[PDB]
Amino acid sequence: MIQQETRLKVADNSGAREVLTIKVLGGSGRKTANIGDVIVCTVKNATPGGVVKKGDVVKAVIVRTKSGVRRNDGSYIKFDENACVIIRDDKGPRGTRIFGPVARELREGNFMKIVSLAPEVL
Amino acid sequence: SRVGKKIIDIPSDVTVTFDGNHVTVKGPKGELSRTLNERMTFKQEENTIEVVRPSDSKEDRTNHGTTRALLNNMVQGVSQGYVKVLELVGVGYRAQMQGKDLILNVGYSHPVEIKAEENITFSVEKNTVVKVEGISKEQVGALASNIRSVRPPEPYKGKGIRYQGEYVRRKEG
Amino acid sequence: TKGILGRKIGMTQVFGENGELIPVTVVEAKENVVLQKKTVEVDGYNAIQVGFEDKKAYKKDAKSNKYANKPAEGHAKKADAAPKRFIREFRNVDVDAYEVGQEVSVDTFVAGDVIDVTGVSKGKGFQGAIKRHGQSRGPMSHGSHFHRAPGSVGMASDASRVFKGQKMPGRMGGNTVTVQNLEVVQVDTENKVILVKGNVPGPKKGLVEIRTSIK
Amino acid sequence: MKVRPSVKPICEKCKVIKRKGKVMVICENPKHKQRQG
RNA sequence: ACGGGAUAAGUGCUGAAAGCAUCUAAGCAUGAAGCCCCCCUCAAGAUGAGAUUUCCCAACUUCGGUUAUAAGAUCCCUCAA
RNA sequence: UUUGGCACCUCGAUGUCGGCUCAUCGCAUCCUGGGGCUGUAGUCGGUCCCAAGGGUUGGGCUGUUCGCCCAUUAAAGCGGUACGCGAGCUGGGUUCAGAACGUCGUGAGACAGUUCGGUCCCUAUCCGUCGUGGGCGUAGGAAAUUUGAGAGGAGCUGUCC
RNA sequence: UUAAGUGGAAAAGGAUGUGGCGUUGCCCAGACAACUAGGAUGUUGGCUUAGAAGCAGCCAUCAUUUAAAGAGUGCGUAAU
Numbered sequence: 028m029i030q031q032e033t034r035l036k037v038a039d040n041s042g043a044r045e046v047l048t049i050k051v052l053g054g055s056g057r058k059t060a061n062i063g064d065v066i067v068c069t070v071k072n073a074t075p076g077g078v079v080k081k082g083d084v085v086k087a088v089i090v091r092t093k094s095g096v097r098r099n100d101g102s103y104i105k106f107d108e109n110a111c112v113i114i115r116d117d118k119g120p121r122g123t124r125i126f127g128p129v130a131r132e133l134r135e136g137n138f139m140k141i142v143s144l145a146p147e148v149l
Numbered sequence: 150s151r152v153g154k155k156i157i158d159i160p161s162d163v164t165v166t167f168d169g170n171h172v173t174v175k176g177p178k179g180e181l182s183r184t185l186n187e188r189m190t191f192k193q194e195e196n197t198i199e200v201v202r203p204s205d206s207k208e209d210r211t212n213h214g215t216t217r218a219l220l221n222n223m224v225q226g227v228s229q230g231y232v233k234v235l236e237l238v239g240v241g242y243r244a245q246m247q248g249k250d251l252i253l254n255v256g257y258s259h260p261v262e263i264k265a266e267e268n269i270t271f272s273v274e275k276n277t278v279v280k281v282e283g284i285s286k287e288q289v290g291a292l293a294s295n296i297r298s299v300r301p302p303e304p305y306k307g308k309g310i311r312y313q314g315e316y317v318r319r320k321e322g
Numbered sequence: 323t324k325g326i327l328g329r330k331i332g333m334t335q336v337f338g339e340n341g342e343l344i345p346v347t348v349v350e351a352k353e354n355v356v357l358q359k360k361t362v363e364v365d366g367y368n369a370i371q372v373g374f375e376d377k378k379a380y381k382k383d384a385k386s387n388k389y390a391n392k393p394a395e396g397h398a399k400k401a402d403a404a405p406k407r408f409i410r411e412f413r414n415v416d417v418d419a420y421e422v423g424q425e426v427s428v429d430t431f432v433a434g435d436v437i438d439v440t441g442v443s444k445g446k447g448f449q450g451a452i453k454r455h456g457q458s459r460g461p462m463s464h465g466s467h468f469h470r471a472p473g474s475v476g477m478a479s480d481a482s483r484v485f486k487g488q489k490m491p492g493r494m495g496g497n498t499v500t501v502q503n504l505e506v507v508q509v510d511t512e513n514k515v516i517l518v519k520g521n522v523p524g525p526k527k528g529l530v531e532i533r534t535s536i537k
Numbered sequence: 538m539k540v541r542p543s544v545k546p547i548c549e550k551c552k553v554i555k556r557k558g559k560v561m562v563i564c565e566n567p568k569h570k571q572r573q574g
Numbered sequence: 575a576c577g578g579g580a581u582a583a584g585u586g587c588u589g590a591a592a593g594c595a596u597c598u599a600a601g602c603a604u605g606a607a608g609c610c611c612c613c614c615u616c617a618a619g620a621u622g623a624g625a626u627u628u629c630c631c632a633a634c635u636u637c638g639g640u641u642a643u644a645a646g647a648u649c650c651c652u653c654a655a
Numbered sequence: 656u657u658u659g660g661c662a663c664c665u666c667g668a669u670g671u672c673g674g675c676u677c678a679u680c681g682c683a684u685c686c687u688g689g690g691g692c693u694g695u696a697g698u699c700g701g702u703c704c705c706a707a708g709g710g711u712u713g714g715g716c717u718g719u720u721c722g723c724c725c726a727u728u729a730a731a732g733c734g735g736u737a738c739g740c741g742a743g744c745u746g747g748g749u750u751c752a753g754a755a756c757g758u759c760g761u762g763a764g765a766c767a768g769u770u771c772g773g774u775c776c777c778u779a780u781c782c783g784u785c786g787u788g789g790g791c792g793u794a795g796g797a798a799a800u801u802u803g804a805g806a807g808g809a810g811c812u813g814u815c816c
Numbered sequence: 817u818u819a820a821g822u823g824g825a826a827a828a829g830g831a832u833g834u835g836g837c838g839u840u841g842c843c844c845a846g847a848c849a850a851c852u853a854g855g856a857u858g859u860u861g862g863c864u865u866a867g868a869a870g871c872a873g874c875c876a877u878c879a880u881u882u883a884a885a886g887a888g889u890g891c892g893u894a895a896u
Contacts, residue, residue: 031713031726054814055712055728067726084726101335101343151593151850186600207591211599214590219601222588290587291603298585298604305696318566322696358626365626365801391646393628393799400627409800445655448786451677460676460744468744473676475784477739479669481680484784487808489677492786496655500613525655536612537576538584538692540703543830550891553831556597560831563596568694573830574703575813583704584691594850606690607812608705614809617802621792624802631796645798 028094029060029109034071038090038110038129039122042077043070046087046111062092062130063138066111078121079113087111088118088138090129090145104130104149112141120144150202153213158198158220163227165198167191172220176227178268178284183223189216198224222286230284233293237277239308242300245273255300255310263296278313323419324430324534325412326351327374328516329527330441336507336517346507347518349530354426355403359417369413370420373398373406374529380405408529414536428514431506436535440500441524449494457489499523503535544571 029035029048037043046068051060060066065088073081091110097103106128113121118138129145142148163176171184185191189212191200198220202213237244237253244253251263251271265271269292272280279296283289293312302309304320311317328351338344358371378388380395390398390405398405401423431437451457451472460468472491476484500523507517522530544562546553551564560573 050713050726052727055710055730057727058713099343100337100341150591152590154593183601208599211589211591214593215600216590218589285588287588287602292587294586295603320696360626360801367625371626371800391628391799393646395628397627397800411801458676465745466675468676471676471743473678474740474743475677477679477736480736480739482783485679486785486806488785490785497614502613528655538703540692541830545830552596554596555832567692570693572703582690592848592850606705607687608689608708614807616807617805619792620802620804620806623792623794624804627798627800629796629798645796647798 029064029066029089029092030058033109035068035087035089035109035111037087037113038126039112039120040124040126041113041120041122042074042079043072043085043113044074045070045072046085046113047071049084052086060089061094062089062096063132063136064089065114068111085113085121086116087113088133088136088141090125090133090141091127096130096132098132106130114138114141150210150214150217153200153202153210153217156199156201156217158200158217158224160196160198160224161228163224165193165224167193172223174220174223174227176224178230179227180268181223181227181285183219185216185219186212188212191216191220226284226286230282231286231289232280232282233289234278234280234313235293235297235310236279236313237300237310238302238306239300242308243276244279245276246271251279251296253296253299253310261299263292263299266292323415324435325372325415326354326426326428326430326516326532327372327408327410328352328530328532329375330522330524330530331515332526333521338507344507344519345521347520347522349516349518349522349532350514351428351516351532352514355401355406356420356422356424356426357398357401357403357406357409359420359422360411361417367413368417369411370415370417371409371411372426373403373409375407376404377407378405410531412533414533427511428516429509429511431509431516431532433506433508435506437504437506437518438500438502438533438535439504439518439522440498440531440533441522441528442496442498443523444525445495447493447495448491450491451489454491454494455489502537539571540574541571542573544573 030051031048033048035046035048037046048060048066048068050067051057052065052067053060065086067084067086070079070081070083070085073079079085089109089111091106091108093106093109095103095105110127112125115121118136119140123144125141125145127145128147128149129142131148133142133148160176163174163179166173166175170187171182173179174181174183188209189200189202191198193199200213200217200220202209237255239255242253242255244251246252247262249265249271251265251273253261253263255261263271266288268284269288270282272282274280281289281293281296283292297310297312300309302311302315302317304318305322307317307319328349331348331350333345333347335343335345353376354372354374356370357373360367360369360371362368377390380390380392387407394405403423446453450470452459452470457472459470460466462469472489475488475490501520504518504520504522507519509516516532518532524530544553544560546562547569548564548566551562551569553560553562555561562569562571564570
């Protein structure tokens with residue numbers, strides 16, 4: 028349940044560490060995003076070196092939220108922190124590695140490259 | 150009105166049954182039932198329907214020519230009928246018969262169906278040229294316009310359903 | 323076609339095909355009978371009339387609604403029925419497929435039927451404009467003395483009055499509401515219950531009317 | 538269709554009629570097709 | 575995101591006046607989230623007084639009217655969906 | 656919908672700008688365009704009909720109606736409605752007593768040029784404006800079981816496969 | 817003798833309005849008829865202008881075929 032102004036840790040190696048969300052893409056008035064949605068965000072904390080630099084305006088996909096999803100069989104999955112992954116506007120990542128587990132519903136938005144690179148999809 | 154003064158209007162082999170405000174006209178292909186008017190009068194001499202107008206007003210001078218052309222059209226369509234012809238200019242633009250109805254394929258996701266009506270007969274000559282035959286001029290004109298309004302002619306290539314003698318302003322864009 | 327009356331019992335859930343979870347309202351539709359046919363030649367509209375839950379026979383000097391009065395007894399005497407607690411009329415059925423006195427049974431609905439469900443909603447009492455309508459509150463700090471009131475209610479010297487239908491506080495609650503396009507999940511002939519996917523209006527043990535959906 | 542308070546024949550084949558209480562002009566080219574309003 | 579009617583701008587067909595042509599004057603078609611018909615309350619307060627089970631009779635009694643006596647309601651009492 | 660006139664009430668008082676909350680008389684319309692015609696290839700442009708049927712965003716920046724960028728979205732009027740709404744709310748603006756700077760003034764002081772500080776009342780009645788009851792009715796006694804005229808009200812929009 | 821709800825709201829241009837006389841001037845060799853039957857020509861002759869032979873724009877703007885027709889009324893036209 029990610030809205031404007033929240034901070035998400037970045038779960039890849041593109042050089043960002045922290046990101047602040049600016050908009051939730053979608054419709055007019057869409058307030059909150061969750062696992063699988065694409066946000067546009069600023070980098071507030073970068074890693075020295077690295078492709079993406081501080082002050083950049085990127086878009087990301089949300090993997091991992093703290094208030095996670097309900098699935099169709101009435102089971103749920105929650106995580107312990109909100110994380111994201113910076114993407115390349117063709118749903119490819121900008122980094123090359125993904126750290127941490129990642130929800131299964133990323134396959135429904137065709138983020139196959141993210142789902143492959145991750146240590147186990149949950 | 151020279152039209153209302155062309156009020157000979159001779160049936161060839163057709164009966165003309167006045168019934169007051171309404172006329173029946175029966176020939177080879179009869180059953181033409183029209184309520185014409187009240188202001189105009191008419192008469193049958195021997196084999197000649199004459200229509201008279203009263204009072205020489207403007208409105209009567211309209212309705213003279215109208216009722217005359219209506220009657221002439223009725224008995225002439227009872228005798229010989231009317232036929233309207235149109236043609237398909239397109240690539241893969243084809244139509245054919247489906248019993249009594251017509252089926253066209255003009256580049257949609259679906260073929261268009263034209264359900265035939267009474268007193269109306271289609272004929273697909275070379276799967277590009279269609280003729281409609283009927284006994285009333287209004288019916289063939291209306292159903293010609295209805296089938297040609299499915300695909301009007303194009304400005305650039307002229308593709309569509311056009312009439313047989315219809316000029317199309319071909320533009321070069 | 324196909325209506326029936328029930329008491330809403332409560333809500334549970336059921337696991338469907340390939341393990342999909344389905345939330346479910348169980349509705350007990352026990353002992354319906356056709357009390358009357360109304361016709362276009364006697365009443366001017368075709369309908370049937372169903373009573374639902376049977377109550378006790380008329381008893382001299384009884385105070386409550388547990389016992390029928392004489393008119394209710396005489397009405398349920400024309401069909402060979404006991405007096406019933408609730409009676410409603412159904413207009414969507416075909417009146418020729420029914421017989422006065424016959425039982426309307428739960429298995430007239432099959433699983434997969436899409437239904438409309440009518441009930442009277444819960445009931446909440448005098449509520450204000452934040453809960454009753456969707457109105458938004460004033461600031462809760464910065465000196466505000468405006469928290470849960472409605473705003474202005476009109477303009478000024480033009481229209482020196484308040485327009486009808488203005489969304490003020492008042493009594494919130496029990497109106498009749500139907501939901502459309504719910505569906506039957508399973509029908510249980512032995513317990514005489516229907517399972518409806520979804521939730522239906524009204525409190526527990528309150529009357530519901532099920533009809534076959536139109537759209 | 539040009540809709541203007543001053544309808545005038547432009548080409549010599551444009552002609553002026555009245556349909557449904559309005560003044561129109563009809564040429565054979567559809568650029569000279571006008572209506573008073 | 576009903577699907578029916580009637581329609582706007584428009585497209586037509588037939589068709590004269592205006593002895594031709596022309597969507598129009600008479601006719602006939604078509605034509606839009608707009609206009610009118612399948613959710614909800616009142617709904618004889620629609621002070622003009624809509625439609626579908628029981629009960630009804632005095633002892634007199636200008637059967638008015640009095641006690642009555644009659645049909646179902648209430649007061650009161652235990653409550654809550 | 657900035658000026659002219661006033662003076663045509665109000666010096667026995669008609670509360671001033673923004674903002675919030677709530678609308679809506681209700682109209683030359685941004686979106687959908689719903690449709691359509693062309694000095695309309697799709698994409699545009701332009702016009703017509705239709706519409707206020709329905710929709711018509713969150714932030715950074717001010718002193719205020721003025722603006723300006725960021726990021727979205729199918730899209731970001733018209734104001735009479737007392738520049739709609741303070742007996743519904745705020746008091747940032749302006750302006751009351753303090754104080755200071757520039758400037759003008761011999762001076763007391765002024766400007767409106769800046770600047771920091773600064774009290775906004777009311778139990779709702781003749782009345783007009785949402786919800787919920789008692790009775791004048793009531794025409795067989797009376798009582799338990801349903802009209803559908805409309806007084807009617809609810810308008811509900813749209814994007815990607 | 818009228819026909820906007822003018823009644824019960826004037827306006828600049830644009831079309832066809834009740835007509836109407838004061839008109840004025842057009843034809844049984846047949847009034848506007850429409851009908852459709854003739855469409856020309858040495859002759860673009862000339863400067864011939866992107867040729868253009870109704871049409872860069874200046875005519876040089878002459879006999880016709882026929883009861884009748886233009887160095888072609890004109891529709892046009894890259895020209896036909």
